[PDB]
From a paper:
Lassa virus (LASV) is an enveloped, ambi-sense, bi-segmented RNA virus endemic throughout Western Africa and is the most lethal of all known Old World arenaviruses. SSP is not only critical by functioning as a trans-acting maturation factor, but also associates with the GP2 subunit, resulting in a tripartite mature GP complex on the viral surface.
To account for possible effects of chemical fixation, we exploited a previously reported stable cell line expressing non-infectious virus-like particles (VLPs) displaying the full-length LASV GP but lacking the Z. Similar to the fixed virions, VLPs purified from cell culture supernatants were covered with GP spikes (VLP pH 7). To study GP conformation at endosomal pH, we determined the VLP-derived GP structure at pH 5.2 (pH 5, and S1 Fig VLP pH 5). The structure was resolved at 16-Å resolution and revealed conformational differences when compared to the same structure at pH 7.3 (pH 7). The fitting was unambiguous (cross-correlation coefficient 0.86) and placed the GP1 structure to the membrane distal part of the spike. Interestingly, the triad of histidines that has been indicated in LAMP1 binding points towards the crevice between GP1 subunits, the putative LAMP1 binding side. The histidines may act as a pH sensor opening up the spike at pH 5 to create a binding site for LAMP1, but further studies are needed to test this hypothesis. Here, the membrane-distal GP1 remained bound to the membrane-anchored GP2 at pH 5.0, possibly providing an analogous shielding function and at the same time creating a binding site for the intra-cellular receptor LAMP1.
Residue numbers in the entry: 81 to 237
The structure:
C-alpha cells in the first residue's frame, strides 16, 4: 500500500488542470519511483508527459532559463496516468546553482514564494526574476491524480 502525500514532513500542493483530473506536487524524502528510467516509448505517453509539465509551467508562470542543466528524473505510467520523480540536487549551494534551469527548480521557487511548506534559500541566478532554490528535500514528485485521492500517493506502475 502506498504512502501518504499529505504528511507533516511533506510539502504539497494540488494543481487542478481539468474538471476532474490534476497534478499532485509533493516535496518529500520518500522515493516513489524505484528505477532510473523515463520510457516515453510511444507518442501518447510522450504527450501526457508534455501535458503534465506544460500545465505546471503555465500555472506557475515559469519562465525557465536555458542553462543546459537537468534534474535526475524518473517517470512511470499507470493506465494513462503519469508519475514523475525528480531526484533533486538542491541540497547545497553549488548544486542549486548547477540545477537552476529546470522545471523542478521552478516548482521549488513557487513553493518558496507562495509559502506552501518548507524553508528554502534563493540564490540570485543570472537571469531576471529567476532564483536558484536550495532545499533539503530529496525528491519532487508529480502525479496525475484527482482532488479526492491527492492526499495519498498513487501507484506508479
Ligand atoms: C530530508 O533529508 C535530509 C537529509 O538528506 C534531512 O536532513 C537535512 O539535510 C540537509 C542537507 O544535508 C541539512 O542541511 C539539514 O541540516 C538536515 N536537517 C535535519 C533536520 O537533519 C531533512 O531534514 C529531511 N527532511 C524531512 C522533512 O524529512
Ligand atoms: C532516485 O533515487 C532513488 C532512490 O535513491 C532511485 O531508486 C533506486 O534505483 C536503482 C536503479 O538504479 C535501484 O536499483 C534501487 O533499488 C532504487 N532504490 C530505491 C530505494 O528505490 C532512483 O533510481 C533514482 N532516480 C534517478 C532518475 O536517479
Ligand atoms: C524502459 O525500457 C528499458 C529498455 O527498453 C527496459 O529495460 C525497462 O524495463 C523499461 N522500464 C519500464 C518502467 O518499463
Ligand atoms: C491524467 O490522465 C488522464 C488519462 O490519461 C488524462 O485525460 C488527463 O489529462 C491527465 N491529467 C493531466 C493533468 O495530465
Amino acid at each position: 500500500t502506498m504512502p501518504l502525500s499529505c504528511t507533516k514532513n511533506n510539502s504539497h500542493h494540488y494543481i487542478m488542470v481539468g474538471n476532474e483530473t490534476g497534478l499532485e506536487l509533493t516535496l518529500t524524502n520518500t522515493s516513489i519511483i524505484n528505477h532510473k528510467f523515463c520510457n516515453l516509448s510511444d507518442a501518447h505517453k510522450k504527450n501526457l508527459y508534455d501535458h503534465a509539465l506544460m500545465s505546471i509551467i503555465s500555472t506557475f508562470h515559469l519562465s525557465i532559463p536555458n542553462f543546459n542543466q537537468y534534474e535526475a528524473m524518473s517517470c512511470d505510467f499507470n493506465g494513462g496516468k503519469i508519475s514523475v520523480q525528480y531526484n533533486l540536487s538542491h541540497s547545497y549551494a553549488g548544486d542549486a546553482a548547477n540545477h537552476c534551469g529546470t522545471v523542478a527548480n521552478g516548482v521549488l521557487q513557487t513553493f518558496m514564494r507562495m509559502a506552501w511548506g518548507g524553508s528554502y534559500i534563493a540564490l540570485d541566478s543570472g537571469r531576471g526574476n529567476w532564483d536558484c532554490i536550495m532545499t533539503s528535500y530529496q525528491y519532487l514528485i508529480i502525479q496525475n491524480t484527482t482532488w479526492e485521492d491527492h492526499c495519498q500517493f498513487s501507484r506508479p506502475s
